[PDB]
């Protein structure tokens, strides 16, 4: 074989005159598009059609969740289209899809992205050389292990790829793919049947004599193609013969192959639309007598005082036995996050305990999932930013990690808004709260305060730039004038913002109540005033594509009805000392 699709020219050359071409050995997918090769028919199905098996395979074992790894070319993309089209009849299933470009020796990062996806079954299509790199990279991350499944194309099991191939893999081989001759006898048989069926028709014309002097197509040729595609003759040396719309063969038979003891064995054979199980024992990767099996959540947060607390683990020792005001020991978990304590900023191992953590573990007992949490590097939750061309970069902060996949799920005190909402799915609100203002009691009429409306350099009103409140100010046209006065003298973080009012540096502070009221209780030197405006709720972020959120909301509601939240707010909102001062 020289390069690939060495029978490319003929399909073009005959194609000019519409002379039908029949390939014996070209399993190549790029010939399936009628547009580019319109005369092309074959006695073998392309590599893309192999997906018919996988869907049937997927069908039997009941794994609806898989991952697809394809090379980037007409071949891989066609395979993806075919499988997805198969899935389209079902609710469309793009559990995940992963595209890599050919000739790339190191694929590690992409698989690192793959592990995060919950679905543990994998299917891949690539060239032999690429497949070597795929298995080579996959073995490094130990994705060849049990609990993971591999489904593959004929090319992948063969060649150098076979050498580096993982154990327990599932594989395919087309029958009589190597033999031209059987396909010869049969193809010619079909041609004969087609012709004899053809000459039954009239107004036939012989094909052009010689290339020279003929600029015109051959009117019969498409007809010859039409009969030939419909030409039956089910009895053949190769197996049943019928042709799909693309001229590709239908109802071909493949032999499933297994890697047992690092050698190829036939576990079963596939013929027609139904798989057949050979007597041989099933093998899965790693040790399984039978194991049809088909697990982690990376969680991200921000440092917000009421719903999250940060203390480092004492030396190696983990977490304090510190107890809630109601006698209970405080629960805690480990979180890796930004540290400003060192002059440089290392992502630092830390201990974090919170309302959201108790909620998360409550879910974790309720939900099949297991959790590992690290705080986002940026102190900000997230905001759209950076470069002008096209749309460039992405909103900085934990949200950005969610789209990036650095964390698959976000647990924090996040207000829920439409601008964000289009990008991601949002869990039903655990909490309901609205923005408000903190000012010291000890001697602001409304959300609309004439005092705000009458701004003063002398009377400050302070906020955090890139806080969602700022997004409210920028996005909203109606108050758009009022935004700028707030923009002046902004603070970077929550602690500093509360402190300014406490330090009396700033006369007023504006933030959502859930973070603020707890503090209002905490000091009572400071007070919240007016009516919660921008009334909103706090919820757990997930990608729209992830179905776990469907349970999450379903769980959130279940947690609301029993009063679990009420008791949790009751625990974490102290309420001890404060009152309406006047």
């Amino acid at each position: 074989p020289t390069d690939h699709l060495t029978p490319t020219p003929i399909s073009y050359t005959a194609g000019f005159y519409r002379i039908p071409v029949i390939g014996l050995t070209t399993r190549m997918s790029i010939y399936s598009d009628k547009s580019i090769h319109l005369s092309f028919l074959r006695t073998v199905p392309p590599y893309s059609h192999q997906a018919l098996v996988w869907f049937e395979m997927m069908r039997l074992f009941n794994w609806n969740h898989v991952i697809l790894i394809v090379s980037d070319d007409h071949e891989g993309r066609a395979a993806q289209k075919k499988l997805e089209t198969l899935l389209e009849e079902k609710e469309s299933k793009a559990d995940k899809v992963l595209q890599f470009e050919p000739g790339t020796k190191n694929l590690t990062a992409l698989l690192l992205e793959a592990k995060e996806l919950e679905a543990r079954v994998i299917i891949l299509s690539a060239s032999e050389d690429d497949a070597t790199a795929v298995y080579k990279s996959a073995a490094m991350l130990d994705m060849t292990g049990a609990g993971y499944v591999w489904l593959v194309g004929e090319r992948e099991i063969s060649g150098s790829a076979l050498r580096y191939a993982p154990d327990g893999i599932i594989g395919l081989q087309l029958i009589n793919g190597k033999n031209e001759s059987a396909h010869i006898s049969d193809a010619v048989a079909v041609v004969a049947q087609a012709i004899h069926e053809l000459f039954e028709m009239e107004q036939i014309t012989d094909p052009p004599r010689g290339c020279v002097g003929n600029t015109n197509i051959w009117k019969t040729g498409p007809l010859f193609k039409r009969v030939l595609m419909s030409s039956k003759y089910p009895d053949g040396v190769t197996g049943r013969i019928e042709f799909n719309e693309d001229g590709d063969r239908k109802f071909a038979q493949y032999s499933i192959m297994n890697l047992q003891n690092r050698k190829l064995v036939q576990v079963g054979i596939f013929d027609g639309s139904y798989i057949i199980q050979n007597d041989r024992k099933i093998i899965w990767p790693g040790g399984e007598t039978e194991r049809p099996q088909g697990t982690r959540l990376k969680i991200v947060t921000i440092h917000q005082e009421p719903f999250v607390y940060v203390r480092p683990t004492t030396s190696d020792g983990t977490c304090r036995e510190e107890y809630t005001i109601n006698g209970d020991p405080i629960k805690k978990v480990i979180c890796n996050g930004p540290d400003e304590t060192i002059p440089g900023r290392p992502t630092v191992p830390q201990c974090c305990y919170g309302f959201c953590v108790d909620l998360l573990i409550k879910l974790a007992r309720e939900m099949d999932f297991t959790y590992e949490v690290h705080l986002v590097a940026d102190g900000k939750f997230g905001t759209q930013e950076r470069v002008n061309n096209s749309n460039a970069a992405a909103w900085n902060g934990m949200m950005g990690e969610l789209l990036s996949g650095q964390a698959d799920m976000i647990v924090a005190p996040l207000t829920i808004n439409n601008e964000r909402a289009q990008y991601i799915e949002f869990s039903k609100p655990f909490k309901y709260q609205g923005l408000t203002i903190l000012v010291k009691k000890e001697i602001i009429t409304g959300i609309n305060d004439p005092r705000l409306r009458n701004p003063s350099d002398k009377f400050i009103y302070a906020t955090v730039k890139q806080s969602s409140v700022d997004i409210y100010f920028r996005r909203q046209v109606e108050l758009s004038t009022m935004y700028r006065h707030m923009e002046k003298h902004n603070y970077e973080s929550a602690a500093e913002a509360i402190q300014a009012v406490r330090d009396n540096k700033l006369h007023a502070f504006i933030w959502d109540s859930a973070v603020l009221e707890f503090e209002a209780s905490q000091k009572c030197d400071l007070v919240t005033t007016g009516e919660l405006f921008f009334r909103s709720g706090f919820g757990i972020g997930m990608r729209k594509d992830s179905p776990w959120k469907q349970e999450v909301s379903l769980n959130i509601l279940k947690s609301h009805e029993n009063g679990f939240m009420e008791e949790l707010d009751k625990t974490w909102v102290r309420y001890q000392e404060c009152d309406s001062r006047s």
Partner: protein
């Protein structure tokens, strides 16, 4: 020292044996660092064997580094063939006329091939400009499996029915007749090979699609040379093509040579390296020819004679000058339009060769019963029909619409909505004018309609002309609204159901909705009856209507809340279909209205109330 490049050019056809030989290649722009060495050859009729053999034959030891192809032929296929040779040789080839210029499948990236025909995408764009110019809004696409489909479908999508039929598996069924018969649309875009257009057209002639009000629009390929036109094509057929008159074929060839030698000069300037390479196809491609890729990278945009040859990744030139052409009666191809770069210009004014729905608000749209004796509408009143009778609409929407129509210069049909007035959602489905906007029974919906995220999502909205929103009207965030029960006497407030206000309320504030359902009122006059005669304390509604009603009352018994400064600050917009619409053109018109200060006058006349008199 002396860097003389080796180049070859071929002409096919020309309607002559003894086709004009070596007319060009005469030294021009000699200053360019490499001087061209040219060998010219001609061949009479095209073949895959003849062309392949000859081009390889010229390759010999000759070592030509470039080729230009030109033809008298209408043939689609030729370009691809020469392109194939290019893929094999890595020797640049381009073509200036006819089939080579005719579009082809997406070129292999490694391969080097160029065409002086326009880009498929560009052509689709021009077709769209043409339809927009005549304001033919509604159209369908008939296509064939030939290459560029779905590059075309996608391009149209980005910029009624889409049909894909395989010419292969040629039909006894007249399957094309069976589909084509279905489409009811007035303006049809067709895409196919030159030969295919004939069959599709004979079939259309059987179907009755060529006649009377339907019109067809075509890309470069079908018209091809334009020298030969089977009359199977219907008359009034509209299509774009490159002009022979502007520049003759030798001038075009001069352009090609100039591109090749300019690319050679620039590549020289960069690496001081001879582009010359061994031309022979039969053996393996010459070494360092693999290096040639950068040439393509250099060659994509080239300029000489104050003229840009810049290509696109596909290998079509980025913006060659183009002409809008029509089939004049009989066999004539007579030019209609010129189009270049960004902009298009067309000659004929008129008759070459939007219906709107509203609802009555009496503040932004007033229905009146026309004088029966007169039999038709009077003065500012414009007709609107309601399926159940002619009603006469006049008011703010009528006037704004009227000015807009005057400025953008289009004509429109106005009717009244039946189901659900302003759009309303019950479970899964939309209702109201928005329905007629979605059903395409209406292009644009006008009225007192408020704006919201959902409707902006489904349909593009015009910029707000007026300051409005939710507001309160009473006689004379505190949570007094949030609960009535906190106050021992029962409090009362209500709004009109199926409103953007009620939906917004249900979205943000549930308790208020669930409580206010009892206080909901039939109509604004009746809601007013609940406020005015007692039995209701406060009323909530659109801010513009509440302000106009504040100004206009039988007694100044009613006023706004606070400064009438409204939350949910919004304005009245106007519906459109989707990303495809006159769109921005409308928007400009709108702020021109305020730009001349008309809106203040219209505000004083229509919006201004007498109350708010003590000011």
């Amino acid at each position: 020292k002396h860097p003389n490049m080796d180049i070859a050019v071929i002409l096919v056809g020309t309607t002559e044996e003894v086709a004009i030989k070596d007319v060009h290649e005469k030294d021009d722009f000699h200053h360019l660092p490499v001087t061209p060495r040219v060998e010219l050859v001609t061949m009479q009729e095209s073949d895959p064997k003849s062309i392949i053999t000859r081009i390889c034959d010229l390759m010999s030891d000759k070592k030509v580094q470039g080729v230009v192809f030109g033809d008298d032929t209408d043939q689609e296929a030729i370009a691809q063939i020469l392109d194939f040779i290019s893929v094999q040789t890595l020797t640049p080839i381009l073509g200036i006329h006819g089939g080579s210029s005719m579009i082809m499948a997406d070129k292999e990236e490694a391969s080097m091939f160029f065409q002086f025909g326009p880009s498929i995408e560009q052509q689709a764009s021009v077709m769209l400009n043409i339809m927009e110019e005549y304001d033919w809004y509604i159209f369908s696409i008939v296509t064939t499996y030939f290459p560029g489909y779905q590059d075309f479908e996608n391009k149209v999508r980005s910029t009624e029915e889409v049909i894909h039929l395989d010419m292969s598996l040629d039909d006894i069924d007249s399957k094309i007749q069976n589909q084509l018969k279905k489409l009811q649309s007035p303006v049809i875009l067709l895409y196919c090979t030159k030969e295919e257009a004939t069959y599709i057209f004979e079939v259309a002639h059987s179907v009755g699609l060529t006649g009377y009000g339907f019109t067809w629009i075509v890309p470069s390929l079908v018209a091809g040379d334009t020298d030969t036109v089977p009359d199977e094509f219907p008359t009034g057929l509209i299509s774009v093509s490159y002009d022979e008159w502007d520049y003759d074929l030798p001038a075009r060839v001069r352009d090609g040579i100039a591109i090749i030698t300019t690319a050679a000069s620039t590549m020289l300037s960069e690496h001081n390296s001879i582009p010359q390479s061994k031309s022979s196809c039969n053996n393996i491609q010459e070494s360092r020819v693999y290096e040639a890729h950068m040439l393509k990278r250099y060659l994509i945009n080239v300029t000489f004679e104050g003229r840009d040859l810049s290509f696109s990744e596909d290998g079509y030139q980025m913006h060659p000058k183009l002409v809008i052409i029509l089939l004049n009666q009989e066999r004539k191809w007579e030019r209609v339009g010129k189009y270049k770069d960004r902009s298009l210009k067309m000659w004929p004014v008129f008759d070459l060769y939007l219906s709107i729905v509203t609802l009555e608000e009496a503040p932004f749209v007033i229905v009146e019963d026309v004088d029966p004796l007169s039999g038709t509408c009077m003065r500012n009143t414009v007709p609107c029909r309601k399926q159940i009778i002619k009603r006469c609409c006049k008011g703010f929407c009528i006037d704004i619409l009227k000015k807009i129509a005057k400025t953008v210069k289009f004509t429109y049909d106005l009717y009244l909505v039946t189901n659900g007035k302003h759009g309303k959602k019950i479970n899964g489905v939309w209702n109201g004018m928005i329905g007629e906007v979605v059903t395409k029974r209406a292009y644009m919906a006008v009225g007192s309609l408020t704006i919201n995220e959902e409707r902006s999502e489904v349909v593009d909205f015009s910029v707000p002309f007026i300051e409005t929103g939710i507001s309160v009207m009473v006689s004379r965030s505190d949570k007094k609204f949030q609960r009535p029960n906190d106050f021992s006497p029962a409090f009362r407030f209500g709004t009109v159901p199926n409103g953007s206000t009620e939906r917004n309320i249900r979205n943000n504030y549930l308790e208020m909705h669930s409580y206010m359902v009892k206080f909901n009122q039939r109509s604004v006059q009746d809601a007013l009856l609940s406020l005015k005669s007692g039995k209701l304390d406060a009323f909530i509604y659109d801010a513009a209507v509440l302000n106009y009603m504040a100004g206009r009352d039988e007694g100044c018994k009613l006023v706004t809340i606070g400064s009438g400064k409204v939350f949910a600050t919004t304005g009245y917009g106007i519906a459109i279909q989707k990303d495809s619409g006159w769109k921005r053109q409308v928007d400009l018109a709108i702020l021109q209205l305020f730009g001349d200060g008309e809106m203040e006058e219209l505000e004083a006349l229509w919006l201004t109330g007498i109350c708010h008199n003590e000011k």
